[PDB]
Protein backbone atom coordinates (compact mmCIF):
# COMPACT_ATOMS: atom_id res chain seq x y z
CA UNK A 1 0.00 0.00 0.00
CA UNK A 2 1.18 3.53 -0.86
CA UNK A 3 -1.69 5.85 0.16
CA UNK A 4 -0.20 6.29 3.65
CA UNK A 5 2.14 8.51 1.62
CA UNK A 6 -0.85 10.41 0.17
CA UNK A 7 -1.97 11.18 3.73
CA UNK A 8 1.29 13.15 3.94
CA UNK A 9 0.80 15.56 0.96
CA UNK A 10 4.43 16.25 -0.14
CA UNK A 11 2.94 18.87 -2.53
CA UNK A 12 2.16 21.25 0.34
CA UNK A 13 5.88 22.11 0.27
CA UNK A 14 5.90 23.45 3.85
CA UNK A 15 9.69 22.88 4.04
CA UNK A 16 10.00 24.81 0.77
CA UNK A 17 7.93 27.52 2.45
CA UNK A 18 9.89 27.74 5.66
CA UNK A 19 13.22 27.68 3.77
CA UNK A 20 12.24 30.69 1.65
CA UNK A 21 10.97 32.55 4.73
CA UNK A 22 14.30 31.96 6.54
CA UNK A 23 16.53 33.08 3.67
CA UNK A 24 14.84 36.54 3.54
CA UNK A 25 15.50 37.29 7.21
CA UNK A 26 18.19 39.70 8.40
CA UNK A 27 20.92 38.58 10.89
CA UNK A 28 18.86 40.25 13.60
CA UNK A 29 15.05 40.39 13.20
CA UNK A 30 12.79 43.04 14.74
CA UNK A 31 9.39 42.68 16.49
CA UNK A 32 11.02 40.70 19.36
CA UNK A 33 9.38 37.21 19.40
CA UNK A 34 11.92 35.91 22.03
CA UNK A 35 14.58 33.58 20.61
CA UNK A 36 15.36 30.33 22.41
CA UNK A 37 18.96 30.28 23.71
CA UNK A 38 20.20 28.04 20.87
CA UNK A 39 18.84 30.29 18.11
CA UNK A 40 20.31 33.28 19.87
CA UNK A 41 23.76 31.62 20.11
CA UNK A 42 23.75 30.49 16.53
CA UNK A 43 22.82 34.02 15.39
CA UNK A 44 25.53 35.52 17.61
CA UNK A 45 28.23 33.33 16.10
CA UNK A 46 27.02 34.16 12.63
CA UNK A 47 27.07 37.90 13.30
CA UNK A 48 30.49 37.71 15.03
CA UNK A 49 32.10 36.21 11.96
CA UNK A 50 30.29 38.84 9.86
CA UNK A 51 31.18 41.99 11.85
CA UNK A 52 34.73 40.69 11.59
CA UNK A 53 35.32 39.52 8.00
CA UNK A 54 36.50 42.92 6.76
CA UNK A 55 37.60 44.72 9.95
CA UNK A 56 41.24 45.81 9.35
CA UNK A 57 42.71 47.47 12.50
CA UNK A 58 46.09 47.96 10.76
CA UNK A 59 46.42 51.18 12.80
CA UNK A 60 47.82 48.77 15.42
CA UNK A 61 50.89 47.71 13.43
CA UNK A 62 54.47 48.95 14.01
CA UNK A 63 53.59 50.12 17.53
CA UNK A 64 56.61 48.31 18.92
CA UNK A 65 59.50 48.59 16.43
CA UNK A 66 62.35 49.57 18.78
CA UNK A 67 61.88 46.12 20.31
CA UNK A 68 61.25 44.65 16.85
CA UNK A 69 64.14 46.45 15.04
CA UNK A 70 66.73 45.52 17.70
CA UNK A 71 65.72 41.87 17.35
CA UNK A 72 66.06 41.85 13.54
CA UNK A 73 69.43 43.66 13.81
CA UNK A 74 70.62 40.60 15.70
CA UNK A 75 69.00 37.83 13.62
CA UNK A 76 70.47 39.53 10.55
CA UNK A 77 74.04 39.14 11.88
CA UNK A 78 73.46 35.68 13.39
CA UNK A 79 72.45 34.06 10.08
CA UNK A 80 76.04 34.63 8.91
CA UNK A 81 77.38 31.42 10.45
CA UNK A 82 76.63 27.87 9.28
CA UNK A 83 75.51 24.53 10.80
CA UNK A 84 79.28 24.12 11.41
CA UNK A 85 80.57 27.27 13.14
CA UNK A 86 77.48 27.08 15.39
CA UNK A 87 77.44 23.28 15.91
CA UNK A 88 81.06 23.63 17.02
CA UNK A 89 80.05 26.65 19.13
CA UNK A 90 77.23 24.66 20.80
CA UNK A 91 79.72 21.85 21.36
CA UNK A 92 82.22 24.39 22.75
CA UNK A 93 79.70 26.02 25.08
CA UNK A 94 78.57 22.57 26.21
CA UNK A 95 82.10 21.66 27.31
CA UNK A 96 82.44 25.07 29.01
CA UNK A 97 79.30 24.44 31.13
CA UNK A 98 80.95 21.28 32.49
CA UNK A 99 84.12 23.17 33.42
CA UNK A 100 81.94 26.00 34.74
CA UNK A 101 79.97 23.47 36.82
CA UNK A 102 83.12 21.73 38.03
CA UNK A 103 84.27 25.30 38.86
CA UNK A 104 81.67 26.35 41.44
CA UNK A 105 81.66 22.80 42.82
CA UNK A 106 85.15 23.59 44.14
CA UNK A 107 84.24 27.22 44.93
CA UNK A 108 81.65 27.07 47.73
CA UNK A 109 82.87 23.86 49.40
Amino acid sequence: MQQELGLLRPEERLIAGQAKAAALQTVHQLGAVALTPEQAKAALLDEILRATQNLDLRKYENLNTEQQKAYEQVQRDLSQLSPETKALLIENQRKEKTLLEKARKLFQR
Binding site: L44, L57, Y60, Q75, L81, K86, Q93
Partner: protein, 354 residues
Protein backbone atom coordinates in the same frame (compact mmCIF):
# COMPACT_ATOMS: atom_id res chain seq x y z
CA UNK B 1 26.47 53.61 24.94
CA UNK B 2 27.90 50.42 26.54
CA UNK B 3 31.04 50.48 28.66
CA UNK B 4 33.84 47.90 28.24
CA UNK B 5 36.10 47.28 31.22
CA UNK B 6 38.98 44.77 31.14
CA UNK B 7 40.21 44.08 34.67
CA UNK B 8 43.81 42.78 34.46
CA UNK B 9 46.20 41.95 37.31
CA UNK B 10 48.46 44.77 36.16
CA UNK B 11 46.38 47.03 33.91
CA UNK B 12 42.75 48.12 33.58
CA UNK B 13 41.66 48.88 29.98
CA UNK B 14 38.34 50.70 29.78
CA UNK B 15 36.37 52.52 27.14
CA UNK B 16 33.29 52.65 25.03
CA UNK B 17 31.81 49.80 23.07
CA UNK B 18 32.30 50.30 19.32
CA UNK B 19 35.49 52.33 19.83
CA UNK B 20 38.68 50.87 18.32
CA UNK B 21 40.81 51.03 21.43
CA UNK B 22 40.32 51.78 25.13
CA UNK B 23 40.44 55.42 26.26
CA UNK B 24 41.99 54.71 29.64
CA UNK B 25 44.79 52.30 30.51
CA UNK B 26 46.14 52.52 34.07
CA UNK B 27 47.78 50.36 36.76
CA UNK B 28 45.43 48.16 38.80
CA UNK B 29 46.66 49.55 42.10
CA UNK B 30 45.05 51.15 45.16
CA UNK B 31 47.05 53.31 47.58
CA UNK B 32 46.24 54.26 51.16
CA UNK B 33 48.68 56.11 53.45
CA UNK B 34 50.76 54.83 56.40
CA UNK B 35 42.76 56.47 49.19
CA UNK B 36 44.34 56.94 45.73
CA UNK B 37 44.14 54.89 42.49
CA UNK B 38 46.03 54.30 39.26
CA UNK B 39 48.77 56.61 38.01
CA UNK B 40 48.18 58.90 41.00
CA UNK B 41 49.12 55.98 43.25
CA UNK B 42 52.37 55.32 41.29
CA UNK B 43 53.54 58.88 41.97
CA UNK B 44 52.84 58.98 45.70
CA UNK B 45 54.32 55.49 46.34
CA UNK B 46 56.74 56.79 48.97
CA UNK B 47 53.88 57.88 51.24
CA UNK B 48 51.24 55.29 50.25
CA UNK B 49 50.96 51.58 51.00
CA UNK B 50 50.23 49.79 47.70
CA UNK B 51 47.88 46.85 47.18
CA UNK B 52 46.79 44.93 44.07
CA UNK B 53 43.08 43.97 44.10
CA UNK B 54 43.46 41.45 41.26
CA UNK B 55 45.85 38.57 41.81
CA UNK B 56 46.65 36.10 39.04
CA UNK B 57 43.57 37.22 37.02
CA UNK B 58 41.15 36.80 39.89
CA UNK B 59 39.76 39.62 42.11
CA UNK B 60 40.70 38.93 45.75
CA UNK B 61 40.02 42.25 47.49
CA UNK B 62 36.65 43.83 46.83
CA UNK B 63 36.91 47.30 48.44
CA UNK B 64 39.97 48.22 46.41
CA UNK B 65 38.22 46.79 43.37
CA UNK B 66 35.33 49.11 44.28
CA UNK B 67 37.84 52.06 44.23
CA UNK B 68 39.26 50.80 40.91
CA UNK B 69 35.78 50.62 39.36
CA UNK B 70 34.73 53.96 40.91
CA UNK B 71 37.91 55.54 39.49
CA UNK B 72 37.26 54.02 36.08
CA UNK B 73 33.73 55.43 35.78
CA UNK B 74 34.22 58.92 37.14
CA UNK B 75 37.85 59.96 36.63
CA UNK B 76 38.80 57.98 33.56
CA UNK B 77 35.58 57.75 31.52
CA UNK B 78 33.67 60.61 33.17
CA UNK B 79 30.31 58.80 33.14
CA UNK B 80 27.57 57.65 35.49
CA UNK B 81 27.28 53.84 35.79
CA UNK B 82 23.50 54.33 36.23
CA UNK B 83 23.25 55.34 32.55
CA UNK B 84 25.47 52.84 30.75
CA UNK B 85 25.30 49.07 30.33
CA UNK B 86 28.62 47.49 31.42
CA UNK B 87 30.71 44.71 29.90
CA UNK B 88 33.20 43.24 32.35
CA UNK B 89 35.77 40.52 31.96
CA UNK B 90 36.89 37.60 34.05
CA UNK B 91 39.73 35.11 33.91
CA UNK B 92 38.86 31.58 32.68
CA UNK B 93 37.76 29.33 35.55
CA UNK B 94 36.66 32.36 37.56
CA UNK B 95 34.82 30.78 40.50
CA UNK B 96 31.05 31.35 40.47
CA UNK B 97 30.98 33.07 43.91
CA UNK B 98 33.36 35.57 42.24
CA UNK B 99 31.27 36.36 39.10
CA UNK B 100 28.21 36.74 41.35
CA UNK B 101 29.94 39.17 43.72
CA UNK B 102 31.00 41.05 40.58
CA UNK B 103 27.36 41.17 39.49
CA UNK B 104 25.99 42.30 42.83
CA UNK B 105 28.51 45.13 43.25
CA UNK B 106 27.67 46.39 39.76
CA UNK B 107 23.90 46.31 40.39
CA UNK B 108 23.69 47.42 44.04
CA UNK B 109 26.75 49.62 44.58
CA UNK B 110 26.94 51.02 41.04
CA UNK B 111 23.31 50.45 39.90
CA UNK B 112 24.23 49.78 36.28
CA UNK B 113 21.17 49.37 34.02
CA UNK B 114 22.51 46.15 32.52
CA UNK B 115 25.72 44.08 32.69
CA UNK B 116 27.63 41.09 31.36
CA UNK B 117 30.68 39.10 32.36
CA UNK B 118 32.61 37.66 29.44
CA UNK B 119 35.68 35.40 29.29
CA UNK B 120 38.88 37.29 28.34
CA UNK B 121 40.26 34.55 26.14
CA UNK B 122 36.96 34.24 24.32
CA UNK B 123 36.95 37.99 23.55
CA UNK B 124 40.49 37.69 22.05
CA UNK B 125 39.44 34.87 19.78
CA UNK B 126 36.39 36.76 18.50
CA UNK B 127 38.75 39.71 17.95
CA UNK B 128 40.90 37.55 15.67
CA UNK B 129 37.74 36.83 13.69
CA UNK B 130 37.13 33.25 14.87
CA UNK B 131 34.78 31.29 17.08
CA UNK B 132 36.94 28.17 17.20
CA UNK B 133 40.63 27.83 18.17
CA UNK B 134 42.91 27.76 21.24
CA UNK B 135 44.05 30.99 22.85
CA UNK B 136 47.28 31.54 24.76
CA UNK B 137 46.57 34.51 27.01
CA UNK B 138 49.46 35.91 29.02
CA UNK B 139 49.30 39.18 30.94
CA UNK B 140 51.03 40.51 34.02
CA UNK B 141 49.78 37.99 36.60
CA UNK B 142 48.64 34.78 34.82
CA UNK B 143 48.97 32.64 31.67
CA UNK B 144 46.10 30.49 30.35
CA UNK B 145 45.66 28.04 27.46
CA UNK B 146 41.98 28.27 26.52
CA UNK B 147 40.57 25.80 24.02
CA UNK B 148 37.41 27.15 22.42
CA UNK B 149 34.96 25.41 20.15
CA UNK B 150 32.13 27.40 18.55
CA UNK B 151 32.23 30.13 21.17
CA UNK B 152 32.44 27.77 24.12
CA UNK B 153 35.48 27.69 26.39
CA UNK B 154 36.05 24.01 27.38
CA UNK B 155 36.41 24.41 31.17
CA UNK B 156 38.09 21.05 31.73
CA UNK B 157 40.73 21.54 29.01
CA UNK B 158 41.83 24.89 30.37
CA UNK B 159 45.42 25.09 31.53
CA UNK B 160 46.53 27.75 34.05
CA UNK B 161 50.07 28.94 34.74
CA UNK B 162 50.88 31.52 37.46
CA UNK B 163 53.88 32.83 35.52
CA UNK B 164 53.49 36.07 33.57
CA UNK B 165 54.67 39.66 32.92
CA UNK B 166 55.56 40.56 36.51
CA UNK B 167 57.64 37.45 37.08
CA UNK B 168 59.60 38.13 33.93
CA UNK B 169 60.29 41.67 35.08
CA UNK B 170 61.44 40.35 38.46
CA UNK B 171 63.63 37.79 36.74
CA UNK B 172 65.24 40.45 34.56
CA UNK B 173 65.77 42.61 37.64
CA UNK B 174 67.62 39.64 39.19
CA UNK B 175 69.83 38.83 36.17
CA UNK B 176 70.60 42.48 35.56
CA UNK B 177 71.53 42.66 39.24
CA UNK B 178 73.77 39.56 38.85
CA UNK B 179 75.53 41.50 36.07
CA UNK B 180 76.48 44.40 38.38
CA UNK B 181 73.58 46.87 38.30
CA UNK B 182 71.17 47.22 41.23
CA UNK B 183 67.41 46.75 40.81
CA UNK B 184 65.75 45.52 44.00
CA UNK B 185 62.81 47.88 44.77
CA UNK B 186 59.41 48.60 43.21
CA UNK B 187 60.61 52.08 42.16
CA UNK B 188 63.13 50.00 40.23
CA UNK B 189 60.52 47.40 39.23
CA UNK B 190 58.79 49.89 36.93
CA UNK B 191 62.16 50.86 35.41
CA UNK B 192 63.16 47.30 34.47
CA UNK B 193 59.64 46.60 33.05
CA UNK B 194 60.34 49.36 30.55
CA UNK B 195 63.68 47.76 29.58
CA UNK B 196 61.88 44.43 29.11
CA UNK B 197 59.33 45.95 26.76
CA UNK B 198 61.97 47.93 24.87
CA UNK B 199 64.59 45.21 24.26
CA UNK B 200 63.76 41.65 25.24
CA UNK B 201 62.94 39.03 22.62
CA UNK B 202 62.52 35.26 22.35
CA UNK B 203 65.21 32.95 20.98
CA UNK B 204 64.21 30.32 18.41
CA UNK B 205 66.64 27.79 19.87
CA UNK B 206 67.98 28.74 23.29
CA UNK B 207 71.26 26.78 23.48
CA UNK B 208 72.02 28.05 19.99
CA UNK B 209 71.37 31.70 20.89
CA UNK B 210 73.54 31.46 24.01
CA UNK B 211 76.37 29.91 21.97
CA UNK B 212 75.99 32.40 19.14
CA UNK B 213 74.35 35.73 20.08
CA UNK B 214 77.66 37.19 21.28
CA UNK B 215 78.79 37.58 17.66
CA UNK B 216 76.34 40.38 16.95
CA UNK B 217 77.68 43.85 17.78
CA UNK B 218 73.97 44.54 18.16
CA UNK B 219 73.42 42.05 20.99
CA UNK B 220 74.60 44.49 23.62
CA UNK B 221 72.38 47.57 23.77
CA UNK B 222 72.66 50.71 25.81
CA UNK B 223 69.61 51.95 27.71
CA UNK B 224 69.29 55.38 29.29
CA UNK B 225 67.72 55.20 32.74
CA UNK B 226 66.20 58.36 34.33
CA UNK B 227 69.50 59.01 36.22
CA UNK B 228 70.82 60.09 32.83
CA UNK B 229 72.63 56.83 33.53
CA UNK B 230 73.57 54.45 30.75
CA UNK B 231 73.54 50.69 31.34
CA UNK B 232 74.17 47.98 28.74
CA UNK B 233 71.96 44.92 28.23
CA UNK B 234 73.00 41.78 26.31
CA UNK B 235 71.98 38.12 26.43
CA UNK B 236 69.53 38.93 29.22
CA UNK B 237 67.28 40.10 26.39
CA UNK B 238 66.43 36.53 25.52
CA UNK B 239 67.34 34.95 28.86
CA UNK B 240 64.37 36.75 30.43
CA UNK B 241 61.42 35.54 28.24
CA UNK B 242 62.97 32.07 27.98
CA UNK B 243 61.39 31.48 31.44
CA UNK B 244 58.03 31.13 29.63
CA UNK B 245 59.38 28.02 27.94
CA UNK B 246 61.56 26.92 30.87
CA UNK B 247 59.89 27.92 34.17
CA UNK B 248 62.71 26.24 36.14
CA UNK B 249 64.69 29.47 35.65
CA UNK B 250 62.78 30.85 38.65
CA UNK B 251 62.22 27.62 40.60
CA UNK B 252 58.92 26.57 39.11
CA UNK B 253 58.46 22.85 38.53
CA UNK B 254 55.68 23.70 36.11
CA UNK B 255 55.85 22.85 32.40
CA UNK B 256 56.44 25.59 29.78
CA UNK B 257 53.82 27.45 27.72
CA UNK B 258 54.37 25.27 24.65
CA UNK B 259 53.76 22.14 26.68
CA UNK B 260 50.71 23.49 28.44
CA UNK B 261 49.33 24.35 24.92
CA UNK B 262 49.91 20.71 23.85
CA UNK B 263 48.52 19.37 27.15
CA UNK B 264 45.45 21.50 26.63
CA UNK B 265 44.90 20.31 23.09
CA UNK B 266 45.28 16.71 24.36
CA UNK B 267 42.44 17.23 26.86
CA UNK B 268 40.04 17.78 23.86
CA UNK B 269 38.34 15.18 21.60
CA UNK B 270 40.78 13.94 19.02
CA UNK B 271 38.22 15.03 16.38
CA UNK B 272 38.44 18.78 17.07
CA UNK B 273 42.23 18.82 17.48
CA UNK B 274 43.00 19.69 13.82
CA UNK B 275 40.93 22.86 14.41
CA UNK B 276 42.85 23.85 17.50
CA UNK B 277 46.24 23.21 15.98
CA UNK B 278 45.51 25.56 13.11
CA UNK B 279 44.01 28.25 15.29
CA UNK B 280 46.53 29.04 18.03
CA UNK B 281 45.78 32.61 18.96
CA UNK B 282 48.12 34.57 21.28
CA UNK B 283 46.84 37.51 23.35
CA UNK B 284 48.07 39.63 26.26
CA UNK B 285 51.05 41.94 26.79
CA UNK B 286 53.42 39.07 27.52
CA UNK B 287 52.96 37.67 24.00
CA UNK B 288 54.56 40.82 22.53
CA UNK B 289 58.12 39.49 22.31
CA UNK B 290 59.61 39.36 18.84
CA UNK B 291 60.32 35.74 17.89
CA UNK B 292 57.57 34.30 20.08
CA UNK B 293 55.30 33.15 17.24
CA UNK B 294 58.24 31.41 15.55
CA UNK B 295 59.40 29.66 18.68
CA UNK B 296 55.85 28.43 19.37
CA UNK B 297 55.53 27.11 15.83
CA UNK B 298 58.77 25.12 16.27
CA UNK B 299 57.81 23.87 19.73
CA UNK B 300 54.27 22.83 18.79
CA UNK B 301 55.46 21.14 15.58
CA UNK B 302 57.84 19.12 17.75
CA UNK B 303 55.03 17.86 20.03
CA UNK B 304 52.13 17.46 17.54
CA UNK B 305 51.59 14.47 15.20
CA UNK B 306 53.84 14.21 12.15
CA UNK B 307 51.62 15.52 9.36
CA UNK B 308 49.51 17.87 11.46
CA UNK B 309 48.95 21.42 10.24
CA UNK B 310 50.15 23.88 12.85
CA UNK B 311 49.49 27.61 12.65
CA UNK B 312 50.30 30.33 15.20
CA UNK B 313 48.41 33.59 14.86
CA UNK B 314 49.69 36.70 16.58
CA UNK B 315 47.75 39.90 15.86
CA UNK B 316 49.66 43.20 16.17
CA UNK B 317 46.89 44.27 18.56
CA UNK B 318 47.09 41.38 21.03
CA UNK B 319 47.92 43.70 23.94
CA UNK B 320 44.39 44.87 23.44
CA UNK B 321 42.56 41.96 21.71
CA UNK B 322 40.53 41.31 24.90
CA UNK B 323 39.21 44.87 25.21
CA UNK B 324 38.65 44.91 21.44
CA UNK B 325 36.70 41.64 21.46
CA UNK B 326 34.62 43.11 24.29
CA UNK B 327 33.85 46.17 22.16
CA UNK B 328 33.00 44.05 19.08
CA UNK B 329 30.65 41.89 21.17
CA UNK B 330 28.87 44.70 23.00
CA UNK B 331 28.19 46.37 19.60
CA UNK B 332 26.39 43.35 18.15
CA UNK B 333 22.61 43.44 17.76
CA UNK B 334 22.29 39.67 18.29
CA UNK B 335 24.07 40.30 21.56
CA UNK B 336 21.59 42.81 22.94
CA UNK B 337 19.23 40.12 24.31
CA UNK B 338 22.14 38.76 26.39
CA UNK B 339 22.66 41.70 28.79
CA UNK B 340 21.65 40.74 32.33
CA UNK B 341 19.11 43.34 33.33
CA UNK B 342 18.07 45.32 36.45
CA UNK B 343 14.64 43.64 36.42
CA UNK B 344 16.16 40.19 35.92
CA UNK B 345 18.62 40.79 38.77
CA UNK B 346 16.10 41.34 41.58
CA UNK B 347 14.15 38.13 40.84
CA UNK B 348 17.08 35.66 40.80
CA UNK B 349 19.71 37.39 42.98
CA UNK B 350 23.30 37.28 41.66
CA UNK B 351 22.68 33.65 40.57
CA UNK B 352 21.55 34.75 37.08
CA UNK B 353 25.22 35.08 36.07
CA UNK B 354 25.44 31.26 35.88
Amino acid sequence: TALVCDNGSGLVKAGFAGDDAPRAVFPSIVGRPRSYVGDEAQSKRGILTLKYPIEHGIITNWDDMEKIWHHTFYNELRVAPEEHPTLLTEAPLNPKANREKMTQIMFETFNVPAMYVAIQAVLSLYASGRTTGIVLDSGDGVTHNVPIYEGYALPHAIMRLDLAGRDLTDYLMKILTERGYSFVTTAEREIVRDIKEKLCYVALDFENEMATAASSSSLEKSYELPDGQVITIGNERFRCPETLFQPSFIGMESAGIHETTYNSIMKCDIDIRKDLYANNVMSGGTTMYPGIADRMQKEITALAPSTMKIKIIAPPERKYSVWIGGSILASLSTFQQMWITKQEYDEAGPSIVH
